[PDB]
Design a protein around this ligand. Structure first.
Ligand code: OLC
Ligand code: OLC
Ligand code: OLC
Ligand code: OLC
Ligand code: OLC
Ligand code: OLC
Ligand code: OLC
Ligand code: 5MC
Length: 319
């Protein structure tokens, strides 16, 4: 149990960090530029395949595996229909991430996208029948400022050789921020509404996710893809991004299961701070004054959020 939590967070933290800069890299240095829509779609395919394997391991046998697929996919059309909503919303979110990093510096993206933290807290209280004390709300905005400081970097020195539309990038992030809170909390509500396996829920969602993301690939880029090919512009780094997005999505679902969507934001900030401090001590990595102050705010916000809060009996007695 202890090791699984350590492996989930160090995987989450290395993947999320590497993901943004690697994605930015692939969008700015290529001559032949791949279709972002296709990478989002292939990510859904990989997550489905890994989730299927994890369900086989969890069920423990081919017969129990087949039985679970039959009851929970073939036999649960309403669950498939419900989870099509976050699949639609996530298809937009993940495509907006590529659009934004095509047009903005990674650090500009990272700071702005942290607005998902208060968004996700609001979605949580509105959709999950939960409350936050006034002190907890303070801690949520404190966390947001802390991670903003943690992520604040000087702009990259490399000159960009492709056209950029930063305003389009900011519009993309604004959409992604709204998507992040709504789809994550929607998935959480479905997951915690029954004892159905996490891996069943992921399979249920990725099935519609593959359909929606491929349809979006067709509608956005179908004509140019018939000309250039679906995998036009793919490189080792494009696959690296897809792999990172796949692992990151799977571990996101795990963190939501064992904690919640608000704790996800606190735990990711703690992991970024601790892994950065580890790299200072192990490798002499240099940090900024912004990071140092943000780290303290992250620490205080975690402390404040966990402090002990009658006015929420419906919350604690039934979920
Ligand atoms: C694999 C992805 C899941 C797609 C649905 C698989 C359905 C199968 O189930 C057959 C069993 C009958 O006993
Ligand atoms: C951005 C915030 C989006 C808030 C949505 C709140 C919501 O969807 O509440 C639904 C309610 O639980 C029943 O329909
Ligand atoms: C609060 C919400 C405020 C943001 C609302 C709209 C942003 C508009 C810009 C977002 C653009 C993403 C969708 C889009 O139009 O994609 C263009 C693409 O280049 C061709 O398909
Ligand atoms: C914050 C919301 C910012 C919304 C910006 C919308 C935008 O700038 O869109 C550019 C347009 O797509 C040009 O091609
Ligand atoms: C393998 C095939 C299923 C894969 C994706 C389905 C995508 C989600 C679409 C599911 C729609 C089911 C539906 O609309 O029927 C619901 C009705 O309430 C009946 O219970
Ligand atoms: C169906 C919805 C799936 C979401 C597909 C969004 C496609 C998109 O917005 O892509 C713009 C393009 O990448 C600009 O270069
Ligand atoms: C925790 C308080 C410890 C304060 C240590 C801060 C170190 C620091 O901010 O280093 C910046 C860098 O050396 C140059 O920008
Ligand atoms: C909840 C959930 C999210 N995801 C993915 O995890 C990511 C969540 O990103 P954010 O924490 O920035 O919203 C998205 O890329 C989404 O597609 C997933 O793959 N499976 C899930 N069950």
């Amino acid at each position: 149990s202890l090791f699984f939590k350590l492996y989930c967070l160090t995987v989450m933290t290395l993947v999320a960090a590497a993901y943004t800069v690697a994605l930015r890299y692939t969008r700015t240095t290529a001559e032949e530029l791949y279709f972002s829509t296709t990478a989002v779609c292939i990510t859904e395919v990989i997550k489905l395949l890994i989730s299927v394997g994890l369900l086989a391991k969890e069920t423990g046998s081919l017969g129990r595996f087949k039985a679970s697929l039959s009851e929970n996919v073939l036999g649960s059309p309403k669950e498939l229909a419900k989870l099509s909503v976050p699949s639609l919303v996530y298809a937009v979110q993940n495509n907006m991430a590529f659009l934004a990093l095509s047009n903005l510096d990674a650090a500009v993206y990272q700071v702005t996208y942290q607005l998902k933290i208060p968004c996700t807290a609001l979605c949580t209280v509105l959709m999950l029948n939960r409350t936050l004390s006034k002190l907890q709300w303070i801690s949520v905005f404190m966390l947001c400022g802390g991670v903003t400081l943690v992520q604040w970097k000087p702009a990259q020195a490399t000159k960009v050789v492709v056209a950029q539309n930063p305003l389009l990038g900011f519009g993309a992030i604004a959409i992604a921020v709204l998507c992040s809170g709504f789809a994550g909390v929607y998935f959480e509500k479905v997951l915690k509404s029954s004892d159905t396996s996490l891996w069943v829920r992921n399979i249920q969602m990725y099935l519609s996710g593959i359909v929606v993301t491929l349809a979006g690939t067709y509608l956005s880029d179908g004509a140019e893809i018939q000309e250039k090919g679906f995998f036009y512009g793919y490189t080792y780094y494009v696959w690296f991004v897809i792999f990172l997005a796949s692992v990151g999505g799977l571990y996101t679902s795990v963190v939501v299961k064992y904690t919640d969507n608000i704790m996800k934001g606190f735990s990711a900030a703690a992991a970024i701070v601790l892994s950065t401090i580890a790299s200072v001590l192990l490798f002499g990595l240099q940090i900024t004054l912004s990071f140092a102050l943000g780290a303290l705010l992250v620490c205080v916000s975690i402390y404040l959020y966990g402090l002990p809060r009658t006015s929420n009996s419906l919350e604690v007695l039934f979920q």
